[PDB]
Amino acid sequence: AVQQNKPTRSKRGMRRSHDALTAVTSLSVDKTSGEKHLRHHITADGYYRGRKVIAK
Amino acid sequence: MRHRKSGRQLNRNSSHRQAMFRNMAGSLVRHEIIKTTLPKAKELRRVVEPLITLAKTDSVANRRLAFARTRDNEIVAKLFNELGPRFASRAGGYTRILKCGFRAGDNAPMAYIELVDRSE
Amino acid sequence: MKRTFQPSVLKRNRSHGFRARMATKNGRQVLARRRAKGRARLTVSK
Amino acid sequence: METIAKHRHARSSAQKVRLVADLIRGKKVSQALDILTYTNKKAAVLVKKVLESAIANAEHNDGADIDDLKVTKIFVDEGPSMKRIMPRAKGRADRILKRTSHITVVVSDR
RNA sequence: GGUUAAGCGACUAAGCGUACACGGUGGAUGCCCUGGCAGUCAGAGGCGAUGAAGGACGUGCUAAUCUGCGAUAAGCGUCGG
RNA sequence: CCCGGCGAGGGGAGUGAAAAAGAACCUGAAACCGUGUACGUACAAGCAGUGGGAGCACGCUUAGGCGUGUGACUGCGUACC
RNA sequence: AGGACCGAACCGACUAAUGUCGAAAAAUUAGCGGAUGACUUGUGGCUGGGGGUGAAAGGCCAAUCAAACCGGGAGAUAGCU
RNA sequence: CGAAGGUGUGCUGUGAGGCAUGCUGGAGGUAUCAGAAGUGCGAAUGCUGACAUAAGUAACGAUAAAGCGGGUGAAAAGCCCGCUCGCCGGAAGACCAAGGGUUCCUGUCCAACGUUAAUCGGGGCAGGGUGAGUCGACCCCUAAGGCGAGGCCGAAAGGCGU
RNA sequence: GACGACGUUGAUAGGCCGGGUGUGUAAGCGCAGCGAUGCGUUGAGCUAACCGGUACUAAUGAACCGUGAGGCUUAACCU
Known part of the structure; x- marks a missing residue:
């Protein structure tokens, strides 16, 4: 539970070698509305494969 | 170890779990749409689809x-x-x-x- | 737990009050040192 | 022509804002707005509210061009601390310091 | 010029190291004074029941606190500058 | 004036000798923290330096080669009080 | 009638758990001992450091007690780090 | 037409150091030779201020419990309403004394506080509210008990007491 | 985190019809009983994850990283 001899800022870096946020670059474009949602999701205006699905 | 089990626990006791899925399914058909999280959406389906299954063949006993x-x-x-x-x-x-x-x-x-x- | 300061103003007044501490000569020196050490609140006042 | 926008004293920590403002290093703006509109975090609330304020400083003060407009440098750097006192058990305290951070967004056409 | 094999063989760098350029936090150094200590020189060497030292509560154009003052309350009269 | 939540914060403009003097305000070191460029680095172990040293990268002179950065690999080497 | 029985409140702390950088500088869940007495609680007083008080443990005297705490002797003294 | 200080740089001395200079800096510095000391820091589990590390780990404070729709709004698991669900009920209900002293309420705001966000809050800004011949005290009467005119007693204070 | 099965050229999941399984004579009517209840309907009814099928819904066109015949020298075979 304790540290006896403080690790350098070197090894503090290499522990942070894998924290990097996964990119969500894979956007989609609508079939018959042309707008952009996230893939397998709905827009801000209720479109999903060219349908007013939620009408909100 | 879950190997071939079903029915996710959703981090509540069984008594709480069953009583929520009542009052969501009560809430589901009254307003026709609900926003939930993904698993409760994925497992309100396994609960509600009995109801409109057991309501096409109408009877007196199936009302209760x-x-x-x-x-x-x-x-x-x-x-x-x-x-x-x-x-x-x-x-x-x-x-x-x-x-x-x-x-x-x-x-x-x-x-x-x-x-x-849906038409409204 | 039953912690030590279970307060009052009736215990407080007749112990650490003005006329209590400015009764005797040994009390009076405290009132004549809190003066000279320039404290605002002399002993206890409301 | 070059322009810079800064949000000073953003109420978080340096590694919390370093992680999403690592992806938008060396990007164009419209792919950066689209990688920050759908990153589910709090720093993506922070700097995407400021990265759009940087392109405002182009279309208004510097180069109105936004289509082919790059982001050159972006580096979140530390700020002060709100040293409150946290109570730990058995009578002893704990000097918490609520962290605070500064972010620059630098926008130009290299 | 092409073909099989044999030997040898960089640029890759998730991060990390070092130097420079860049700030970031930080508030040390130099500089500054109506702050304070030690004394020289005279003067005083007391205030107090024709109500003290130290306080409370009020007073202005005012919300607050400091200074001053006290139902005559940031001030009255009086003789001067 | 733009952007923002008619927030915070910030970029221009105007004052000003200067806003890398902006109310957290003279000067602003070090620890610590990042940005960029250059080099080394994923078969090598160990007080992390020193002696040697290829290549690469640069300021240059004067084109013969020094200066600075890094430093593969190698010889020794078990911190201070 | 009972310093009588059973058992909540109230009280006390027996056993185990958990906790023991605690939710707490002595607790929480499961039980346990009593519960019209030599009991329990509230409020207002009295006693005082070689002194109080004690169904006596050197227990208690503001989480500290084989002599409390603050200031003053006093910058004690230290053949000792 | 740039003092100290800071920050690099080329030179220089056997070392402690010195001298010239680029940038930053914006009003003070001090030769030569001598005089006096709060005169040179790595340690003392030294003091003080600041910043690392463990670590983005642990934990979010009772294992009464949520779920949905609407609205306000820039953004809503937590705020306001409605609809059910679940928990307390010799309490986790409602009044009072103690003790706290605006903590109650409307408008408004989210920097900070609330172990999160927050339009909400016992948070900040502003204003408002506490109305008694019978309620409690103050007031008339004593207990335990404290002072204590004369007094007794004691180096002095002061102790006991009518 | 990996490995595996599918993504409308679909049985990968949920639903659904059936079967299987488990519990036992559902409810509602009528009869017998003043009544509790017993009988008939009725080995009914209900049935988590099990097995066999059915696309009913959810598993989209893309977008994306990954490229553009692969260095030096010698030998042995192509001519």
């Missing part, structure tokens, strides 16, 4: 059966009285899940459950 599982006759009033000819032909599924997005409250995978036949 959807009252023993519901204890809400106003929801039972919408069943059997509109839902009958609404679902004669759908041999099977009645929910088109929609993956909406992300809860700005606490980063949940939000979603949308509906009955299929």
Whole structure:
């Protein structure tokens, strides 16, 4: 539970070698509305494969 | 170790779990759409689809059966009285899940459950 | 737990009050040191 | 022509804003707005509210061009601390310091 | 010029190291004074029941606190500058 | 004036000798923290330096080669009080 | 009638758990001993450091007690780090 | 037409150091030779201020419990309403004394505080509200008990007491 | 985190019809009983994850990283 001899800022870096946020670059474009949602999701205006699905 | 089990626990005791899925399914058919998280959406489906299955073949005894599982006759009033000819032909599924997005409250995978036949 | 300061103003007044501490000569020196050490609140006042 | 926007004293920590403002290093703006509109975090609330304020400083003060407009440098650097006192058990305290951070967004056409 | 094999063989760098350029936090150094200590020189060497030292509560154009003052309350009269 | 939540914060403009003097305000070191460029680095172990040293990268002279950065690999080497 | 029985309140702390950088500088869940007495609680007083008080443990005297705490002797003294 | 200080740089001395200079800096510095000391820091589990590390780990404070729709709004698991669900009920209900002293309420705001966000709050800004011949005290009467005119007693204070 | 099965050229999941399984004579009517209840309907009814099928819903066109015949020298075979 304790540290006896403080690790350098070197090894503090290499522990942070894998924290990097996964990119969500894979956007989609609508079939018959042309707008952009996230893939397998709905827009801000209720479109999903060219349908007013939620009408909100 | 879950190997070939089912019915996710959703981090509540069984007594709490069953009593929520009542009052979401009561809430589901009254407003016809709900926003929930993804698993509750994914597992309200496995609970509600018995109801409109056991309400096409209308009987006297099945009224209490959807009252023993519901204890809400106003929801039972919408069943059997509109839902009958609404679902004669759908041999099977009645929910088109929609993956909406992300809860700005606490980063949940939000979603949308509906009955299929929508015109309002 | 029953913590030590279970307060009052009736215990407080007749112990650490003005006329209590400015009764005797041994009390009076405290009132004549809190003066000279320049404290605002002399002993206890409401 | 070059322009810079800064949000000073953003109420978080340096590694919390370093992680999403690592992806938008060396990007164009419209792919950066689209990688920050759908990153589910709090720093993506922070700097995407400021990265759009940087392109405002182009279309208004510097180069109105936004289509082919790059982001050159972006580096979140530390700020002060709100040293409150946290109570730990058995009578002893704990000097918490609520962290605070500064972010620059630098926008130009290299 | 092509072909099989044999030997040898960089640029890759998730991060990390070092030097420079860049700030980031930080508030040390130099500089500054109506702050304070030690004394020289005279003067005083007391205030107090024709109500003290130290305080409370009020007073202005005012919300507050400091200074001053006290139902005549940031001030009255009086003789001067 | 633009952007923002008619927030915070910030970029221009105007004052000003200067806003890398802006109310957290003269000067602003070090620890610590990042940005960029250059080099080394994923078969090598060990007080992390020193002696030697290829290549690469640069300021240059004067084109013969020094200066600075890094430093593969190698010889020794078990911190201070 | 009972310093009588059973058992809540109230009280006390027996056993185990948990906790023991605690939710707490002595607790929480499961039980346990009593519960019209030599009991329990509230409020207002009295006693005082070689002194109080004690169904006596050197227990208690503001989480500290084989002599409390603050200031003053006093910058004690230290053949000792 | 740039003092000290800071920050690099080329030179220089056997070392402690010195001298010239680029940038930053914006008003003070001090030769030569001598005089006096709060005169040179790595340690003392030294003091003080600041910043690392463990670590983005642990934990979020009782294992009474949520779920949905609408609205306000820039953004809503937590705020306001409605609809059910679940928990306390010799209490986790409602009044009072103690003790706290605006903590109650409307408008408004989210920097900070609330172990999170927050339009909400016992938070900040502003205003408002507490109305008694009978309620409690003050007031008339004593207990335990404290002072204590004369007095007794004691180096002095002061102790006991009518 | 990996490995595996599918993504409308679909049985990968949920639903659904049936079967299987488990519990036992559902409810509601009528009869017998003043009544509790017993009988008939009725080995009915209800049935988590099990097995066999059915696309009813959910598993989209893309977008994306990954490229553009692969260095030096010698030998042995192509001519």
